[PDB]
Design a protein around this ligand. Structure first.
Ligand SMILES: [Cl-]
Ligand SMILES: [Cl-]
Ligand SMILES: [Cl-]
Ligand SMILES: [Cl-]
Ligand SMILES: [Cl-]
Ligand SMILES: [Cl-]
Length: 465
């Protein structure tokens, strides 16, 4: 009946907590977001709730790759944001993804959800408050991991802990029923981004409005095609959550079932908190430091010879590179270069932080990532070979490690012109990036060259001292 009653009655409420896995952390993987089999927090006898019967249509637009299953799970932008690094790191990479970001093309996900809510449930973060308590078993696993003797053993234990419990926990969820449509769009960079985003959003919102309004043929989960006002053909995935699915073929009956508590499910993930952030200091900081996939070391550099025609000097770390450490590309930094070292051992099924590189088969001397979808920061000034220094110690990066950078172009002629990559200079960045002055050649000879880097390394991924 009413949501307020549910929270009161322990049996109605526990069915709500259990059927929706509200105590479970979320595991990100190749198939998407999966509830842990273990409970992460202590079960409360009552839930913080905010009543809302107001049906609305919301729309989320997303340019971040690897987030499609989260979009289909009705995560909002903020929830996708927090969850992005985890799912990116745990995704199954491939060279043949329909999602494509190139020099000419750009892709994005758009999801529209017709909500039929009953309210929103919030789990208070430690800053009370109603405050949640981490499970004794979980906080035990943490203590045990931190009690290990060597760094690797500590980190390896933390990974198992998080692989088991999950990387994020849903701290705010809406419940009820939902009819949602999800699509991906790939478009030329020569198009107006605003126009494409509004055009897709309008077409997708119109589709779900007709669905939940009862003006279109009723239907459950299925795939289809819609056409925008600008004649864009979109492949759409329709998803239903909550309510009685046996009644979905008749939309209005479906909507009526939304008022039945037995059929309420999560219809939107509104806020997500990284599990580690549920920890009190200084345990929180110890874990997060250990979780960092790379160690960092600033070393001196040396100018590269053969680059007198170039508008700037090119620098590489001064040999010899300490064994087990790697560099990330030619820089214009004459003072220091960053070396990195992976903190986690390579294991089958695990996406390593770094990838080695190999020279292209075509008419190019530029490196290509061995591992699909991995990224590097600089063009290679010279001829790359994986078996010869310094290319032998050069490494690419797992996609979660990088953000888009920005070019500062130098040169009086294109053929010698270079881009110097800086962190993006938006005033309030969510993820802070290293300034590495990664060097990118403006025009490369000749086609067969890999896509041009414009990336910056996240500081949150590198552990110092
Ligand atoms: Cl899914
Ligand atoms: Cl709570
Ligand atoms: Cl469901
Ligand atoms: Cl190749
Ligand atoms: Cl690249
Ligand atoms: Cl840019």
């Amino acid at each position: 009946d009413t949501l307020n009653d549910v929270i009161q009655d322990p049996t109605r409420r526990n069915k709500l907590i259990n059927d929706n896995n509200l105590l479970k952390g979320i595991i990100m993987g190749r198939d998407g977001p999966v509830p842990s089999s273990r409970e992460l927090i202590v079960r409360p006898d009552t839930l913080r709730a905010i009543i809302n019967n107001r049906a609305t249509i919301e729309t989320t637009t997303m340019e971040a790759e690897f987030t499609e299953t989260l979009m289909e799970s009705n995560y909002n932008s903020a929830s996708v944001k927090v969850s992005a690094p985890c799912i990116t790191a745990n995704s199954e990479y491939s060279e043949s993804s329909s999602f494509k970001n190139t020099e000419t093309e750009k892709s994005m996900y758009t999801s529209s959800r017709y909500l039929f809510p009953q309210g929103r449930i919030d789990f208070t973060t430690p800053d009370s408050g109603d405050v949640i308590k981490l499970s004794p078993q979980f906080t035990s696993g943490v203590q045990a991991a931190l009690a290990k003797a060597t760094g690797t053993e500590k980190r390896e234990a933390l990974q198992n802990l998080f692989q088991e419990y999950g990387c994020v926990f849903r701290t705010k969820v809406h419940i009820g029923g939902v009819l949602s449509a999800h699509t991906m769009e790939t478009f030329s960079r020569s198009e107006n981004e605003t126009e494409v985003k509004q055009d897709v959003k309008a077409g997708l919102e119109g589709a779900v409005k007709g669905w939940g309004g009862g003006a279109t043929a009723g239907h459950g989960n299925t795939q289809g095609t819609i056409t925008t006002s600008q004649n864009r053909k979109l492949n759409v995935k329709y998803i239903v959550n909550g309510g009685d699915y046996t009644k979905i073929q008749n939309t209005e009956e479906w909507v009526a079932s939304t008022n039945q508590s037995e059929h309420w499910r999560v219809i939107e993930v509104t806020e997500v908190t990284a599990v580690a952030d549920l920890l009190p200091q200084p345990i929180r900081g110890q874990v997060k430091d250990l979780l960092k996939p790379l160690l960092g070391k600033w070393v001196d550099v040396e100018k590269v010879p053969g680059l007198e025609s170039l508008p700037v000097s090119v620098y590489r770390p001064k040999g010899a590179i300490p064994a087990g450490w790697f560099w990330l590309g030619d820089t214009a930094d004459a003072s220091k270069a960053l070396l990195v070292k992976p903190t986690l051992p390579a294991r089958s099924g695990r996406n390593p932080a770094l990838t080695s590189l190999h020279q292209g088969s075509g008419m190019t001397e530029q490196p290509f990532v061995d591992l699909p979808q991995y990224q590097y920061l600089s063009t290679y000034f010279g001829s790359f070979a994986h078996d010869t220094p310094p290319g032998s110690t050069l490494r690419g990066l797992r996609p979660d490690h990088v953000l888009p950078g920005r070019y500062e172009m130098h040169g009086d002629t294109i053929s010698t012109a270079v881009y110097v990559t800086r962190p993006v200079d938006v005033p309030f960045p969510e993820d802070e990036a290293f300034d590495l002055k990664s060097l990118v050649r403006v025009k490369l000879p000749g086609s067969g060259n890999p896509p041009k880097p414009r990336s910056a390394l996240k500081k949150s991924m590198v552990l110092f001292d």
